[PDB]
Paper text:
Phytochromes constitute a class of biological photoreceptors which harbor a linear methine‐bridged tetrapyrrole as a chromophore. The minimum functional entities are the photosensor (photosensory core module (PCM)) and an output module which is frequently a histidine kinase. In our previous studies, we intensively used the bathy phytochrome Agp2 from Agrobacterium fabrum as a model system, providing valuable insight into structure and reaction mechanism of phytochromes in general. Agp2 carries a biliverdin (BV) chromophore, which upon light excitation of the dark state Pfr photoisomerizes from ZZEssa to ZZZssa and subsequently runs via a sequence of thermal decays to Pr.
Additionally, we introduced a probe at Tyr205, a site that modulates the interactions between the B‐ and C‐ring propionic side chains during photoconversion—a critical step preceding propC deprotonation. For Y205oCNF, the crystal structure of Pfr was determined experimentally at a resolution of 1.79 Å. This structure reveals a very high overall agreement, even in the CBP, with a root‐mean‐square deviation (RMSD) of 0.28 Å compared to the WT Agp2 PCM. However, introducing the oCNF reporter group leads to an in‐place rotation of the Y205oCNF side chain by ≈20° compared to Tyr205 in WT‐Agp2 PCM. Together with the lack of the hydroxyl head group in oCNF, this alteration leads to a slight restructuring of the HB network around the BV chromophore in the Pfr crystal structure. On the one hand, a new water molecule is visible in the oCNF region of CBP, on the other hand, there is a slight shift in the head group of propC and a different rotamer orientation of Ser260. Since Tyr205 directly interacts with the propionic side chains, initially with propB and propC in Pfr and subsequently in Meta‐F solely with propB, one may readily rationalize the effects of the substitution on the chromophore, which is visible through small changes in the Y205oCNF Pfr crystal structure. One exception is Y205oCNF where the nitrile substituent in ortho position in Y205oCNF cannot replace the hydroxyl group of Tyr and its HB interactions, first with propB and propC (Pfr) and later solely with propB (Meta‐F). In Y205oCNF, this coupled process is not completed at pH 7.8. It requires an increase of the pH to 9.0 to achieve the same signal pattern as in the other variants and in WT Agp2‐PCM.
Author numbering:
A (entry chain A): 7 to 80, 86 to 95, 97 to 119, 127 to 503
B (entry chain B): 6 to 80, 86 to 503
The structure:
């Protein structure tokens, strides 16, 4: 039995149940024999008796088995409006772990949605409009986008909602809210469908076969839901969901999460459209993200080139840097910047106090090998840094010399200080047996604890810019030494 | 007016007044209410009697078809295969509006597969290519196999607008053009404009009788702008060129990278030939995918090359940190810098002493080069692919070194790391037959591949392959890495 002590390793790929909005037949790798079936196959497909040990041809008929075998030559195959008795079923077909899984549901959207995002020319504009578009088109009560942080936490970066709902915009949930196996399954599958968070699960018969093997439902869209997540949704009032996974650089960037406060499942044709939309969204996001990065790096290069040209006509470089250092804050996101040269401090924005800087400089001198050194958790490196964490919890240090402990220092505030949460601190949630852990309020509190005394991480882009600055300043120092 | 070699650079190829004979064309007002012009063959092709101009579109084409076409104009020219005409027959129709004119183009329908299926089969056979080279090599073979043309080439445009034949699939009896170049002037600016605006250009018959658009010039003195009409007739100049080659027909797919014309996939046939509209739609889809995949592969290759350079320069920095004598280290190491970017030679000029590796100017030539760079550079990288143009005397050694990229090593001494490239003609890898000759027409031998190639060679005589933006970025990284080696050296010694 799953609970809060073991939900981190819950084997959610092998639950032994499906959701009730479809039925499932598992055959051998050659689609010759029925090995397992969901208990609701009889009712849904109009079949009698234990289906296990009947041939696929027997159960499905000659035509359908032929058509499915053909589809299996060609991601699960999605076959809307297949003809069985002359009825229509939307069929999903795949093979995994030497098992053929057939899923049945009783039977230009993509182009229209894509056309409404393809002209977005910033990441911000893309993510803002997508929740609104998806909500209107797919008819869910709420649509959110989460962006995963470096530590795996999710940030709610976009939201469209019914006017009567509470807001989660600007909120974060901890990494632990989505277990590693769920993340694996959100990388492997574009869509995750939950038709009813209070729907009675349908057993796969048998759950464990004569060889002792569970049925791996990793790629089955009907796979049942963890009791943990069902309780979480029930506490929220959510009754149904569908996520579209967002893939950037071959990895899970985040989710488009659609939540409904009553049961809901989109027809397979619409799901296919949503999947196509998701692929386009991911690719457009990646392209916009690349452009933003390029522009930011080019901005830094341009600024540093201006600095190099400026410095060429200054006899006193220390003075120039005392007069100029504040401008370096524009190179990358930061809340403060400062110059530590010849044991003299010059600060701008949110920095540690004057008297704290020696200790920091000493620490970097010990820890660095003459390149950029950066942390988003100062107090972990330097316990006494805790006192000023409110002002400066993260530091990036650019060395100005290999023989002297002189630095250009960038700082960031504790991440909780920069929060822009649109939600309602008064909003409370009912709970079930597992208690308040499974509520947005507690999730948010847990996240805050995970990032206490910490700042926003220095990204790979931030570090590239810092390295550009380091080398630019080396050049300033060198050309000065050449002349003068 | 007659086009010839003196004025073909500005031939108004958008308004020829004719179409090709493999379809017919009707021009209507912007509302598709009235027929304003038609190709002379509309009568024969669509089975219409009487002068078409002045009649309503509904009269000529039937209310149903006009209704459908009007609908399509609401939802690039629209490509509408297998449209049912008033007499029950099927026509593939291309429909667009431009310069307040609606242009309807008709071809008899054949039997065709869905475009998306044809395109998917092609795309599946390139989508797994994981280098630009592999993509480019396989695409001519695939396109030739799918489309059934006698030759398929890919051209990549050079910085100067010249085309290089970078891939070829051909009938065994044909001559090869692989590794050949044609000069920029072989494709006039307006032709380039129309290859940016139109994914496909179709020529069914380079010796086909042109069909007049009636009237060529309307009552108001206006010609019909056929910029986006697929049936638009072909310049006599190019028709002559094709005939000299023995080519009777062609189709090009434009390749768009970073919003501009990267090059073409050019299909040539030695007998009159045209693809069905459904296959043309598939080709367009393939072209779009090809362009995107190329861009992705090109980005990866660039990233790999920059990262390779950074890794090498980082190794050099770490190496230099434990060397008391940096000049000595460079004297022993400089040849390795040739691996940073494409070059035929590299050398170190320090303290009026030369060390060279590969193809470089002679020892005696280096002082003049360094003095020139010193006067021409503001302390950043300086590079040319045309040394003789900067330094007349460099002509003597252009075969060995026609291009130079100079990295300054000091702001107070004219010390440099120099990269060189041979004259581009020296690095040709032409698979063609020097004894292959071409017949000519009235315009003479200008309009032949042999003369095109000779003209190109003249345009790049004494010149090397240009130093690319990537090359220049790598050079800049090397410059600042060497600044850093010098600075840290001064810090400790
Ligand atoms: C130890 C196990 C836990 C757990 C399991 C699972 N969570 C799954 C999905 C999921 N959970 C959340 C959590 C949220 N925290 C918030 O603050 C918030 C909203 C304000 C939510 C919804 C999210 C965001 C997700 C992703 C899906 C979605 O957003 O709809 C999950 C997968 C279920 C499935 O699809 O099979 C499992 C399993 N949840 C916990 O809270 C911990 C204790
Ligand atoms: C002053 C005008 C000239 C001219 C006009 C046009 N050329 C057009 C297309 C074209 N021409 C070439 C030329 C080649 N040079 C070679 O060496 C070679 C093969 C080995 C060729 C084919 C090319 C490559 C192209 C692009 C199309 C293709 O490759 O099939 C053109 C457009 C015609 C149209 O489609 O309407 C015009 C106009 N050609 C000249 O040579 C100069 C004098
Ligand atoms: Cl468990
Ligand atoms: Cl992002």
């Amino acid at each position: 039995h799953v609970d809060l002590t073991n939900c981190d390793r819950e084997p959610i790929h092998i639950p032994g149940y499906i959701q009730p909005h479809g039925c499932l037949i598992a055959c051998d790798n050659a689609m010759r024999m029925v090995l397992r079936h969901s208990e609701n196959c009889g009712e849904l497909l109009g079949l009698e008796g234990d289906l296990n040990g009947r041939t696929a041809e027997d159960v499905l008929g000659k035509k359908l088995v032929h058509d499915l075998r053909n589809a299996l030559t060609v991601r699960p195959a999605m076959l809307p409006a297949m003809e069985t008795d002359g009825r229509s079923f939307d069929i999903s077909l795949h093979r995994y772990k030497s098992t053929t899984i057939i899923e049945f549901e009783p039977s230009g959207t993509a182009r229209k949605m894509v056309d409404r995002i393809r002209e977005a020319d910033s990441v911000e504009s893309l993510i803002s409009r997508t929740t609104r578009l998806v909500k209107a088109t797919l008819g869910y009560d709420r649509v959110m986008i989460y962006r995963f942080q470096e530590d795996g936490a999710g940030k709610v970066v976009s939201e469209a909602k019914q006017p009567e709902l509470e807001s989660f915009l600007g909120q974060y949930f901890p990494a632990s809210d989505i277990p590693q196996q769920a993340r694996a399954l959100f990388l492997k599958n574009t869509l995750r469908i939950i038709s009813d968070a209070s729907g009675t699960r349908i057993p796969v018969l048998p759950a464990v076969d004569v060889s002792g093997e569970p049925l791996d439902l990793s790629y089955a869209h009907l796979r049942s839901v963890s009791p943990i997540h069902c309780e979480y949704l029930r506490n929220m009032g959510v009754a149904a969901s569908m996520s579209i996974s967002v893939i950037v650089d071959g990895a899970l960037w985040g989710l488009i999460a659609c939540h409904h406060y009553s049961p809901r499942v989109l027809s397979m044709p619409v799901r296919i459209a949503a999947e196509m939309f998701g692929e386009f969204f991911s690719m457009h996001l990646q392209v916009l993200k690349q452009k933003r990065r390029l522009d930011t790096i080019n901005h830094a290069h341009a600024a540093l080139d201006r600095f190099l040209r400026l410095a060429a006509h200054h006899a006193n470089i220390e003075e120039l840097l005392v007069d100029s250092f504040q401008d370096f804050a524009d190179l990358m996101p930061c809340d403060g910047v400062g110059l530590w040269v010849g044991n003299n401090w010059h600060g701008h924005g949110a920095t540690p106090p004057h008297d704290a800087i020696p200790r920091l400089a000493r620490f970097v001198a010990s820890a660095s090998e003459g390149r950029v050194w950066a942390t988003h958790a100062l107090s972990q490196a330097i316990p006494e840094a805790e006192i000023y964490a409110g002002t400066a919890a993260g530091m990036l240090a650019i060395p100005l010399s290999q023989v002297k402990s002189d630095y250009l220092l960038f700082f960031r505030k504790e991440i909780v200080q920069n929060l822009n949460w649109a939600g309602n601190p008064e909003k409370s949630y009912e709970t079930g047996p597992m208690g308040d852990r499974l509520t947005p309020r507690k999730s948010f509190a847990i996240w805050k604890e995970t990032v206490r005394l910490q700042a926003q991480p220095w990204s790979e882009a931030d570090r590239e810019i810092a390295e550009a600055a380091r080398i630019a300043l080396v050049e300033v120092a060198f050309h000065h030494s050449e002349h003068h």
